[PDB]
């Protein structure tokens, strides 16, 4: 399609994003399914892992494994919880 | 590691502005090479792409220590 150019939108979203750590040796996961690259709002691809925390819960996050975080999978920019809970925390 | 790549930059690696590079944590779901420009832009790349593999092979001395 000569009239359509998606590469710029994708290139704008190819920056690393902060992920939270956990204690049971699973992959690092971001808070929800959106992230910012140089001010641009970006959405994680469908199937990407995520943590789903309410706003209250987000305030209780520390650098220690004292928060139980619901694991989810990204779908259309929503972190769909899958039932797994793990102790997640911020990495200094 | 604090950060992981969710997408790969498919374009041309910006060699003229390149300053350092690193490989994200093994606990990231997507294995990635991150190129960092002099102004600090960080660019996720596919470690299996031929141009990325060659760039990290000959630009070994640029790797984050």
From Swiss-Prot, chain A:
MF terms (GO), sorted A to Z: C-C chemokine binding; chemokine binding
Domain of life, per lineage: Eukaryota
Disulphide-bonded residues: 15-37, 33-74, 50-79, 69-88
Keyword DNA-binding: no
Glycosylation sites: 1, 21, 24, 38, 52, 66, 82
Gene Ontology CC, one term: extracellular region
Protein name listed in UniProt: Evasin P1243
Main location: secreted
Record GO biological process: negative regulation of chemokine activity
UniProtKB keywords: Disulfide bond, Glycoprotein, Secreted, Signal
Subcellular location: Secreted
Task performed by this protein: Salivary chemokine-binding protein which has chemokine-neutralizing activity and binds to host chemokines CCL1, CCL3, CCL3L1, CCL4, CCL4L1, CCL5, CCL7, CCL8, CCL13, CCL14, CCL15, CCL16, CCL17, CCL18, CCL19, CCL20, CCL21, CCL22, CCL23, CCL24, CCL27, XCL1, CX3CL1, CXCL1, CXCL2, CXCL4, CXCL5, CXCL6, CXCL7, CXCL9, CXCL12 and CXCL14.
Protein species of origin: Amblyomma americanum (Lone star tick)
From Swiss-Prot, chain B:
Subcellular location field: Secreted
A biological-process GO annotation: immune response
Positions of disulphide bridges: 4-28, 5-44
Function: Chemokine, which displays chemotactic activity for T lymphocytes, preferentially Th2 cells, but not monocytes or granulocytes. Therefore plays an important role in a wide range of inflammatory and immunological processes. Acts by binding to CCR4 at T-cell surface. Mediates GM-CSF/CSF2-driven pain and inflammation. In the brain, required to maintain the typical, highly branched morphology of hippocampal microglia under homeostatic conditions.
Broad class of the protein's primary localization: secreted
Keyword Nucleotide-binding listed: no
Full-sequence range covered: 30 to 94 of 94
Keywords, alphabetical: Chemotaxis, Cytokine, Disulfide bond, Inflammatory response, Secreted, Signal
Name this protein carries in UniProt: C-C motif chemokine 17
GO CC field: extracellular region; extracellular space
GO molecular-function terms, A-Z: chemokine activity; signaling receptor binding
Tissue expr: Constitutively expressed in thymus. Detected at lower levels in the lung, colon and small intestine. Expressed in stimulated peripheral blood mononuclear cells, but not in resting cells.
Induction annotation: In monocytes, up-regulated by IL4 and by GM-CSF/CSF2 in an IRF4-dependent manner (at protein level).
């Amino acid at each position: 399609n000569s009239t359509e150019y998606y590469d710029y939108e994708e290139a704008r979203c190819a920056c690393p994003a902060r992920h939270l750590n956990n204690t049971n040796g699973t992959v690092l996961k971001p808070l929800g399914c959106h992230y910012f690259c140089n001010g641009t709002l970006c959405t994680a691809p469908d199937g990407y892992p995520c943590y789903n925390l309410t706003a209250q819960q987000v305030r209780t996050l520390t650098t220690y494994p004292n928060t139980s975080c619901a694991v989810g999978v990204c779908m259309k920019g929503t972190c769909v919880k899958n039932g797994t809970m793990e102790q997640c925390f911020k990495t200094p | 590691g604090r950060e992981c790549c969710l997408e790969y930059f498919k374009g041309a690696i910006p060699l003229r502005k390149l300053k350092t590079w690193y490989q994200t944590s093994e606990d990231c779901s997507r294995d990635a090479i991150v190129f960092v420009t002099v102004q600090g832009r960080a660019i996720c790349s596919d470690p299996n792409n031929k141009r990325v593999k060659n760039a990290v092979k000959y630009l070994q001395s640029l790797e984050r220590s």
